[PDB]
Design a protein around this ligand. Structure first.
Ligand SMILES: Cc1cc2nc3c(=O)[nH]c(=O)nc-3n(C[C@H](O)[C@H](O)[C@H](O)COP(=O)(O)OP(=O)(O)OC[C@H]3O[C@@H](n4cnc5c(N)ncnc54)[C@H](O)[C@@H]3O)c2cc1C
Ligand SMILES: Cc1cc2nc3c(=O)[nH]c(=O)nc-3n(C[C@H](O)[C@H](O)[C@H](O)COP(=O)(O)OP(=O)(O)OC[C@H]3O[C@@H](n4cnc5c(N)ncnc54)[C@H](O)[C@@H]3O)c2cc1C
Ligand SMILES: *SCCNC(=O)CCNC(=O)[C@H](O)C(C)(C)COP(=O)(O)OP(=O)(O)OC[C@H]1O[C@@H](n2cnc3c(N)ncnc32)[C@H](O)[C@@H]1OP(=O)(O)O
Ligand SMILES: *SCCNC(=O)CCNC(=O)[C@H](O)C(C)(C)COP(=O)(O)OP(=O)(O)OC[C@H]1O[C@@H](n2cnc3c(N)ncnc32)[C@H](O)[C@@H]1OP(=O)(O)O
Lengths: 443, 443
């Protein structure tokens, strides 16, 4: 056939769905409704623009609504879809431009509305120099504030947030990091968080841990931050405390949520309603180690969701087959890579789990420049089964993490990892790869 | 028990064996006889000493005979084992110190004699500024010649050789590369050799291809190199044309050679004689893609041999389970990694094989500094089974090659690679990893 595919949201999942569907089947009418007035941009890059490394914000968009148009795809920014007359029985789609509101129908509907910041309840959040880092507009806001220092407080020592810390220091601010749990990167085992505390500290960041924030001081302006542990003075504050999925519209039309709260999906990205798909951060994914659904709001997973929905609609054969949880981020001079489950998580799930954590190099002892390289393996006591892993390096790669993600994907034991014929040469690895050394193999 | 382990050769295979056995069972009498007067050093490092980047040649050794002694291991350099009275029936081991010759016995024998340069029959090789890069003493000889320029010819455009060209340019010389076959790195598909020709050229290296060397001109000094394509003036010439294993003493004792010419072995590194193992460059290894014995003289495989033999002897349970051929080297601003089979070799072996070759980046389009990244996949037509692949980057690393090595290890298809959840973030990968892009996925 040659019918009508409506994409709600156009950031990553949504743009992927649109771009792939129209390529795979040029008969479709493909329309994207984005509320934000930008479309198809790398949120991941926002801290590099903040920091000054990337000169202009527009650098971050992959495709313009104009290039889209050239390619058969009609994108509307600043259009919010306010209601769907689903099943029910499509029309559906009332939505809003500049001035007006109006109707549309669809044959295939891709929900790709993303995630919004998850705001803690703290009096004084509403003030003038409290910010959030999610969108292009967020970037504009911030980018205005920044030059004109002086003192920043960042709530949340998650990856973005560690990422913001570096950006603000690169922009000359003094920065203190506040975290309610005891370590930075609290969702991973503590050795890694340690490494990070030391690197933040080396670069002038103050890291307050185990800290209850009580309010943001000011008369609508923000100058403080009052905490259980004292008062942090700050004319800019960044809330970096989580995101939650944008599910509200999809519940209105009776799309089912999964246990995570994100929209449920099958290997075809299809929801519970016929003709409705979801993609990207509003959607659950099957975690392959946990053997259940999971929310993993990463941008590469959004692209793989989007592209699967896209292909499926264009009548190609395409399945999405799940995640293992691999992430990497850059914080100052560390590259921090995780995958699978941390020992704590492994334990919480009931495994009889053990961890090893080793410190190697990134190149021969004798090689000029060779840096430290840590690897963590989390495994199942008896079986040897791999459950998760971390590698940290200065390295632009390592990224060695990818090998673990590979193994986690099938069952994959410590034994299997030992048997792997990895690449040796003095500039890149010691003669035993740090993954091999960590395998069984020292403690 | 508490018997006597004798290791002939003490470079990498040999050293690993000795060190692992003594640790694993301290009751062993462990003695190493090395002919070369150095022991336990990184030949792979030699070009970085050549180039000046690593200041002194001793920086390459990992353990001194002294530190070994402290750890229960007796090493003798400048000791050649000249005969073995095998089975036969051990005394065996007549060998030679400084002055003397003498007898020893063994209960376990590890043959780790390595490999020697494989010289093409060329009149005038015997002269004064012709050199080879294999040993610590080779390193001395060249380090003497180097400062004092002026014109270098390298025969052979293998990894050492490309490695040498870089070293020599960093040391001021003009360098011309002479290769008999049509490409640099003739052993791999040609895309890769091409990228290297361009890099070599961009750094001042002249690269003569399809070139028959006829002889080394001079009166016992060398100043030329006469070739089917003209005359290359050269006061220093590096022969970098292959190695062959040192199987001579082992044949004398009736140890069996494999079809490769290297010593045959089992998963326990045991030879055909009871009590006799081999480790390192003298030893074959089972290739897991080709499902037969293979020669893969790399230093990481030597450590893996060595440590297996070692363990086995101290009566730990240990097995070596083959290789897949993964290698990586650095030539100027390229890191070049291959694994499995090139398409050529794939086809020689009779697979219905195809290849894909793609060029991506190492980091988001918008990220500062992101470089190119290429990836080659070699696969079976129908099944989708991976057969080999290459990745080249500037990257320290990528090294992504390890993922393929991983997959090659189990059967592993292009499909499987596709399903992998790798790590995305702007500094390190585009949002589709270049492995993923390559997979089915563009041509
Ligand atoms: C600072 C930062 C750094 C990051 N770094 C990384 C990294 O290093 N690696 C990585 O893999 N990921 C990273 N991410 C994650 C990235 O933002 C997402 O995971 C990815 O872009 C997936 O997006 P998506 O299309 O599902 O939706 P989102 O990017 O959440 O966007 C959906 C858009 O659709 C719109 N929409 C919502 N409701 C409606 C409606 N009712 N009608 C019409 N339109 C609507 C929204 O306004 C929104 O802008 C980072 C994110 C941030 C914020
Ligand atoms: C310039 C250069 C660069 C390299 N780069 C890399 C790289 O980037 N990555 C990688 O994986 N590999 C690399 N290698 C490979 C490395 O040399 C070997 O593959 C590795 O060290 C394995 O060694 P082995 O112990 O089996 O024996 P070898 O290293 O060949 O040494 C065994 C030693 O035992 C001695 N011996 C021999 N016969 C007798 C006898 N009859 N009695 C007593 N003693 C004896 C020899 O004199 C010799 O020095 C490189 C090599 C060179 C030369
Ligand atoms: S914060 C996380 C990041 N978020 C974002 O990426 C937001 C922006 N991205 C997007 O909006 C989508 O990713 C877009 C760009 C809309 C989707 O783009 P397309 O789906 O059109 O994808 P591409 O233009 O990247 O190309 C897709 C096809 O092109 C082949 N290909 C890509 N790159 C290469 C290289 N380097 N060499 C050879 N071929 C390449 C891909 O294989 C793909 O092929 P198919 O034809 O789809 O199989
Ligand atoms: S050109 C190719 C390279 N050639 C060479 O390597 C030549 C020189 N090398 C050698 O001679 C051998 O590799 C030597 C150094 C003699 C062998 O040394 P050992 O066998 O004693 O090995 P190590 O001292 O490296 O230690 C082995 C045990 O130590 C554990 N371990 C290593 N590194 C770490 C780090 N960074 N963090 C924690 N643990 C570490 C190894 O796992 C290994 O453990 P065991 O299981 O006890 O052997």
């Amino acid at each position: 056939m040659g019918k009508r595919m409506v994409v709600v949201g156009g950031v990553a999942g949504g743009a992927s769905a649109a771009a792939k569907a129209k390529r795979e089947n040029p008969e479709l009418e493909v329309v994207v409704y984005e509320k934000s007035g930008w479309v198809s941009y790398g949120a991941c890059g926002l801290p590099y623009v903040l920091s000054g490394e990337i000169p202009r914000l527009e650098r971050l968009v992959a495709r313009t609504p104009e290039e889209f148009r050239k390619q058969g795809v009609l994108v509307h920014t600043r259009h919010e879809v306010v209601d769907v007359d689903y099943e029910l029985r499509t029309l559906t789609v009332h939505d809003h431009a500049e001035g007006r509101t109006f109707q549309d129908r669809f044959d295939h509907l891709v929900l790709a509305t993303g995630a919004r910041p998850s705001l803690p309840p703290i009096p004084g959040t509403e003030q003038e120099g409290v910010y959030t880092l999610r969108t292009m507009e967020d970037g504009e806001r911030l980018l205005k504030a920044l030059p004109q220092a002086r003192r920043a407080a960042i709530l949340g020592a998650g990856y973005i947030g560690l990422e913001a810390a570096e950006a603000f220091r690169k922009r000359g601010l003094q920065v203190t990091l506040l975290e309610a749990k005891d370590r930075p990167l609290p969702h991973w085992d503590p050795e890694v968080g340690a490494l990070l505390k030391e690197e933040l500290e080396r670069h002038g960041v103050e890291v307050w841990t185990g800290v209850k924030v009580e309010a943001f001081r000011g008369m609508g302006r923000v100058e403080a931050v009052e905490t259980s542990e004292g008062v942090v003075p700050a004319d800019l504050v960044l809330l970096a405390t989580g995101i939650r999925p944008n599910t509200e519209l999809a519940q209105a039309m009776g799309v089912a949520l999964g246990p995570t709260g994100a929209i449920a999906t099958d290997e075809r990205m299809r929801t519970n309603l016929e003709g409705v798909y979801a993609a990207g951060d509003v959607a659950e994914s099957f975690h392959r180690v946990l053997k259940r659904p999971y929310w993993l709001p990463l941008g590469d997973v959004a692209n793989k969701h989007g592209r699967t929905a896209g292909s499926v609609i264009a009548g190609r054969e395409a399945r999405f087959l799940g995640v293992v949880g691999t992430a990497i981020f850059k914080a100052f001079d560390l590259a921090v890579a995780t995958t699978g489950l941390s020992l704590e998580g492994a334990l919480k799930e009931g495994f009889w789990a053990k961890k090893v954590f080793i410190q190697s190099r990134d190149g021969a002892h004798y090689y000029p420049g060779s840096g430290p390289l840590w690897v963590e393996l989390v495994y199942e006591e008896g079986t040897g089964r791999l459950l998760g892993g971390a590698v940290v390096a200065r390295g632009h790669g390592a990224l060695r993490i990818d090998v673990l993600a590979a193994l986690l994907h099938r069952e994959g034991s410590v034994e299997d990892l030992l048997a792997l014929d990895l690449a040796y040469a003095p500039p890149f690895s010691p003669v035993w790869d740090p993954l091999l050394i960590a395998a069984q193999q020292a403690r």
